[PDB]
Design an enzyme around this catalytic site. Structure first.
Site, short mmCIF file in Angstrom:
data_model
loop_
_atom_site.label_atom_id
_atom_site.label_comp_id
_atom_site.label_asym_id
_atom_site.label_seq_id
_atom_site.Cartn_x
_atom_site.Cartn_y
_atom_site.Cartn_z
N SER A 263 0.80 -1.26 -0.12
CA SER A 263 -0.24 -0.47 -0.25
C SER A 263 0.85 1.49 -0.40
CB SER A 263 -0.55 0.01 1.08
OG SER A 263 -1.62 -0.53 1.15
N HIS B 241 14.28 22.74 15.98
CA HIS B 241 13.74 20.68 16.64
C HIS B 241 14.04 20.17 15.63
CE1 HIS B 241 11.83 17.91 18.08
NE2 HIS B 241 10.61 18.09 17.32
N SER C 288 12.38 15.92 14.30
CA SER C 288 11.72 14.95 14.47
C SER C 288 11.43 14.11 13.53
CB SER C 288 11.29 14.72 15.94
OG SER C 288 9.89 15.21 16.22
N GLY D 66 8.65 12.31 13.99
CA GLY D 66 7.34 12.04 14.11
C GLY D 66 6.63 10.30 14.20
N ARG D 67 7.84 9.59 15.22
CA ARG D 67 7.25 8.04 15.13
C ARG D 67 7.51 8.48 17.25
NH1 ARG D 67 5.38 5.33 11.07
NH2 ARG D 67 6.12 6.14 8.88
N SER E 121 11.26 6.41 16.77
CA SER E 121 11.46 7.73 17.11
C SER E 121 13.36 7.87 17.19
CB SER E 121 10.49 8.10 18.48
OG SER E 121 10.67 8.87 19.03
N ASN F 83 17.45 18.58 20.08
CA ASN F 83 17.05 19.75 20.10
C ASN F 83 18.57 20.80 19.62
OD1 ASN F 83 14.26 20.25 20.03
ND2 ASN F 83 15.36 18.60 21.12
N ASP G 232 16.51 9.39 21.92
CA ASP G 232 16.65 8.17 21.11
C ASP G 232 17.09 7.74 19.94
OD1 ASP G 232 13.83 8.34 21.91
OD2 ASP G 232 13.39 10.68 20.81
C1 LIG Z 1 1.41 28.57 10.35
C2 LIG Z 1 2.49 27.92 9.14
C3 LIG Z 1 2.54 26.18 9.57
C4 LIG Z 1 4.18 25.95 9.75
C5 LIG Z 1 3.96 24.26 10.23
C6 LIG Z 1 4.96 23.12 11.17
C7 LIG Z 1 4.07 22.95 12.18
C8 LIG Z 1 6.28 22.17 12.63
C9 LIG Z 1 6.00 20.34 12.85
C10 LIG Z 1 6.26 19.76 14.26
C11 LIG Z 1 6.46 18.79 14.08
C12 LIG Z 1 7.33 17.56 15.15
CA LIG Z 2 9.60 10.86 18.30
CA LIG Z 3 -0.92 4.43 1.29
#
Ligand SMILES: CCCCCCCCCCCC
Ligand SMILES: [Ca+2]
Ligand SMILES: [Ca+2]
Ligand SMILES: CCCCCCCCO[C@@H]1O[C@H](CO)[C@@H](O)[C@H](O)[C@H]1O
Ligand SMILES: CCCCCCCCO[C@@H]1O[C@H](CO)[C@@H](O)[C@H](O)[C@H]1O
Ligand SMILES: CCCCCCCCO[C@@H]1O[C@H](CO)[C@@H](O)[C@H](O)[C@H]1O
Ligand SMILES: CCCCCCCCO[C@@H]1O[C@H](CO)[C@@H](O)[C@H](O)[C@H]1O
Ligand SMILES: CCCCCCCCCCCC
Lengths: 255, 256
Positions: free
Chosen positions: A92, A128, A130, A132-133, A138, A142, A170
Site C-alpha cells: 500500500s 527541532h 524529529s 514523528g514516530r 522515534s 534539538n 532516541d
Molecule cells: C503556520 C504554517 C504551518 C507550519 C507548520 C509547522 C509545524 C511544525 C511541525 C512539528 C512536527 C514535530
Molecule cells: Ca518521536
Molecule cells: Ca497507502
C-alpha cells in the site's frame, strides 16, 4: 534584494505570498541500501524497496520585522523531508520516513565585506528535528544554532554551527554522525546551480554529502538531479551509510 | 488582484523566491471530543492516545503554464497537507497520529461572469489524490475528478467543489456515504476579521461535517486563528468517525 538571502527576502514587502527558506523539490530516487533493521517494527518493512519518492517543502515565516532595527527580523521556518515507497503497491505504498524541522530565530540582513565576500545573513535561533514516530523508530534532537551566509560573485557559502541542547535518548550518538556544523556551497554557472551540503565529524570520521545540479526548464519549474552519499540522510538513517541518486523537479535552489 | 482568487494570484508574475498559497496555511493547538483509537489499534501506542493534538495545514499552488488556454488561464498544481500530532504524548514519544497528502493537477481560469449580484471569479477543473501514507490496515485513499467554482458578492465569498470518485477505493469503500460529492466553502469579511465555513453533507445518508473558523491579523503575514470542526471525515482515518474539535493558533493566509 539579493539572490539567496533568506532574511533579505523575508524583509521584502500581496498577502497571498509565501516565502521559502530552503529548497522545495520533488524527485524520484534509488538508494544503494535500505535500512530495514531500523524500521523492523513496521509490518511492511521486510518488503521495503530501494526506489522512493523524495520531497522537501521549506517555508520561512516573518513574524516581527524590525524587532531589533530596520534590517532585523524575528522569524520562524519549517522544513519537511519525506521518503515515500510509491512503487510498493504490494504494501500500500507507505511513507518510510518524514523529518519535521521547525525553527525559531532572530535574523539580520547584513553587508559586512571582507576579501571579496559579502556576509549577507546572520541568523541565530532554535532548531527541532524529529521524525514523528513512537518507540522504537522515534528519532529526535534539538539545537541552538547560528547560520551565516556569504556570497562572492557566482559563489554562495553557508556555515551553520550548532550546540545540541536537551535529551537525545532516541539517538544519543547522533553528533557522532552529524557533527557540530553544516556547510553549504552554491555555484552559479549561468542560470544553472551546482550545490553541495554536508557535515564531517573530524574526530569520528563520519559525515555525509548532498550534491545537486538544477537548471530552469521554464520560468516555473527547474530540473533537478541529486546525489546523497554518507551518513545521516534522514533521522532513521543517522547512523546508516548509503548512496542515493534522484531526478525530478524543483521550485527554488539555494540561490 | 481579487482577494480570494487562487487563479488570479497564480497569474500574477513576481523575484523567483516567492511561493503561492492554494488553501489556508495554519498551525493550531486542538482538543477533540473523541480520539479514534479503534481505527489505529494496529499502532503500539493507540490505547495511550491523548485527545489534545497539534493540527496544521500547509497548502501551496504551483503555476506550471500560464496562458495555456488564453490570457486568463493556467495549468497548475497544488499540494495540501494536514497533520495531527500527539505533541503532548511524551509517554509514547509524541508520534504523528495521521497525515493527509492532497496533490492536485488542474486547469484554472480567472473569470468575470456577473449574475444576480455575484461575480464568478474562479473556474477550476482537475484531478485530486487524497492519501494518508499508511499501509494495511490503516491505509485510506480516494481519487477524484473535480470542478472548483468560486464567486464573490460584497463581503461574501462562496466556493463550491463538486467531484466524481474514480478508480478503486478498496481501503475505504463507503467513503462517499460520509463525504458526499461536493464541498461548500463560505467566507465572510467583517472588517479585517474573516469568518469561514467549510463542509460537506450527504443528503442520502445524513452524514456530513463542518469546519467553522475566525481569524484576525496580528501583522501583515500572521493571523490569530480559532477553529471548530464537527462531524465526520475530519481526516481519512476518521472518515467514518464523528468528533468535535476546537483549536486555537496562528495562520498565514485565510480564504480571502
Ligand atoms: C503556520 C504554517 C504551518 C507550519 C507548520 C509547522 C509545524 C511544525 C511541525 C512539528 C512536527 C514535530
Ligand atoms: Ca518521536
Ligand atoms: Ca497507502
Ligand atoms: C534515478 C532513479 C532510479 C531508478 C530506479 C527505479 C527502478 C528500480 O526499482 C527496483 O525494483 C526492484 C525489483 O523490481 C526492487 O526490489 C528494488 O528495491 C527497486 O529499487
Ligand atoms: C564593487 C566593489 C568595489 C570594489 C571595492 C571593494 C573592496 C573590496 O576589496 C577587494 O575587492 C576586490 C574587488 O574590487 C576583491 O577581488 C578583493 O579580493 C577584495 O579584497
Ligand atoms: C566602483 C567599482 C565598480 C566596478 C566593480 C567591478 C570589479 C569586479 O570585482 C569584483 O568585486 C566584487 C566586490 O568586492 C567582489 O566581491 C568580486 O569578488 C570581485 O571580482
Ligand atoms: C511545465 C509543462 C511544460 C510546458 C512549458 C510551459 C511554458 C512556460 O509558460 C510561459 O512562458 C511564457 C514565456 O516566457 C511566460 O510569458 C509565462 O508567464 C510562462 O508561464
Ligand atoms: C513540491 C513538493 C510536492 C510533494 C508532492 C507529494 C505527493 C504525496 C502523495 C502521497 C500520498 C499517499
Amino acid at each position: 534584494a539579493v539572490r539567496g538571502s533568506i532574511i533579505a527576502n523575508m524583509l521584502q514587502e500581496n498577502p497571498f505570498t509565501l516565502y521559502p527558506y530552503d529548497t522545495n523539490y520533488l524527485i524520484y530516487t534509488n538508494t544503494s541500501d535500505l535500512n530495514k533493521e531500523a524500521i523492523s517494527t513496521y509490518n511492511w518493512s521486510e518488503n521495503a524497496r530501494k526506489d522512493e519518492v523524495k520531497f522537501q517543502l521549506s517555508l520561512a515565516f516573518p513574524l516581527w520585522r524590525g524587532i531589533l532595527g530596520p534590517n532585523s527580523v524575528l522569524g520562524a521556518s519549517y522544513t519537511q523531508k519525506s521518503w515515500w515507497q510509491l512503487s510498493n503497491s504490494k504494501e500500500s505504498s507507505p511513507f518510510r520516513e518524514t523529518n519535521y524541522e521547525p525553527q525559531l530565530f532572530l535574523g539580520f540582513a547584513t553587508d559586512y565585506r571582507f576579501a571579496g565576500w559579502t556576509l549577507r545573513d546572520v541568523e541565530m535561533g532554535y532548531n527541532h528535528d524529529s521524525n514523528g514516530r513512537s518507540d522504537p523508530t522515534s528519532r529526535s534532537w534539538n539545537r541552538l544554532y547560528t547560520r551565516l551566509m556569504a556570497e562572492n560573485g557566482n559563489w554562495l557559502v553557508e556555515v551553520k554551527p550548532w550546540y545540541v541542547i536537551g535529551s537525545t535518548d532516541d539517538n544519543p550518538d547522533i553528533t557522532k554522525y552529524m557533527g557540530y556544523y553544516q556547510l553549504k556551497i552554491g555555484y552559479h554557472l549561468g542560470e544553472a546551480v551546482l550545490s553541495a551540503k554536508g557535515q564531517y565529524n573530524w574526530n569520528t570520521g563520519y559525515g555525509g554529502a548532498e550534491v545537486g545540479l538544477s537548471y530552469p526548464v521554464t520560468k516555473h519549474v527547474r530540473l533537478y538531479t541529486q546525489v546523497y552519499s554518507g551518513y545521516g540522510e534522514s533521522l532513521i538513517d543517522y547512523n546508516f551509510n548509503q548512496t542515493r541518486v534522484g531526478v525530478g523537479v524543483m521550485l527554488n535552489d539555494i540561490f
